[PDB]
Each structure stands twice: as C-alpha cells, then as structure tokens.
Symmetry: C2
Subunit: 70 residues, 2 copies
C-alpha cells in the first residue's frame, strides 16, 4: 500500500515532466527561429536582431548554485 | 522497501520537474522580451518584429490530443 501511493505520485510527477519537456523543446527551438531572422539581417540591414540575440543568451538568475548534478 | 525505491524515483522525477520549471519560466518570459521589441517597432519602423511575433504564437505539433487534463 505504501508504494501504491507513490505509484500515483510518480504518475503526476512524470506527467508534469512530459508536459514540461514538450514546452522546453517547443520554445527552445523557437528561439532558434528568432535567431534565424538574426542570422539573416545581422550585419546587413537590421540592428534590431542583435538586441534579440542578446535575449537568447541572457540568463536570468545567474546565481552560482552549489552542488549541481543529477 | 517497495516504496523506498519509488522514494528515489520521485526524487529524480521532481528534480527533472524543477529543472524544467526554471527552463519553462526562464524562456517563457524571454519571448515576452522579444515581443517587447515588437510592441516598440511594430507599425512604426520595423516589419521584422511582426514575423518574430508570429514565432511566439506559432504552435509546433498542433495535434489535437484526446483526453487532456491533470
């Protein structure tokens, strides 16, 4: 019975994982599309793309977390 | 002992969740920054922003999944 409760818990946990995985990948490849426009107009016509490139490499909460791993 | 194995499993599962949560939110608010540039130049100077706006509302794998919920 003890594990049976966790059987349900790993369910909601992994489903949140799967829900997040599709979001992570979907949006991740999306920045690549915005970079696509950058690699087209950068240094050629539009400087606006450069400041959007900064976005893609700007990391929010750049705190050095101790003990990273899996 | 049975649940003890799942105790480790919910650990890696939730940690993947937390790893994904920070990615989901980080990048999510990031599109908002690219939209920020859009809401500035759109209809005023640069049409390039409009095609990046399309990005933010373009959904990959627009398959209608049956039985959605939590």
């Amino acid at each position: 019975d003890e594990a049976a409760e966790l059987m349900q818990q790993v369910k909601v946990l992994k489903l949140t994982v799967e829900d997040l995985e599709k979001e992570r990948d979907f949006y991740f490849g999306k920045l690549r599309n915005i970079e696509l426009i950058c690699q087209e107009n950068e240094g050629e016509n539009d400087p606006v793309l450069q400041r959007i490139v900064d976005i893609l490499y700007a990391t929010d909460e750049g705190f050095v977390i101790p003990d990273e791993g899996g």
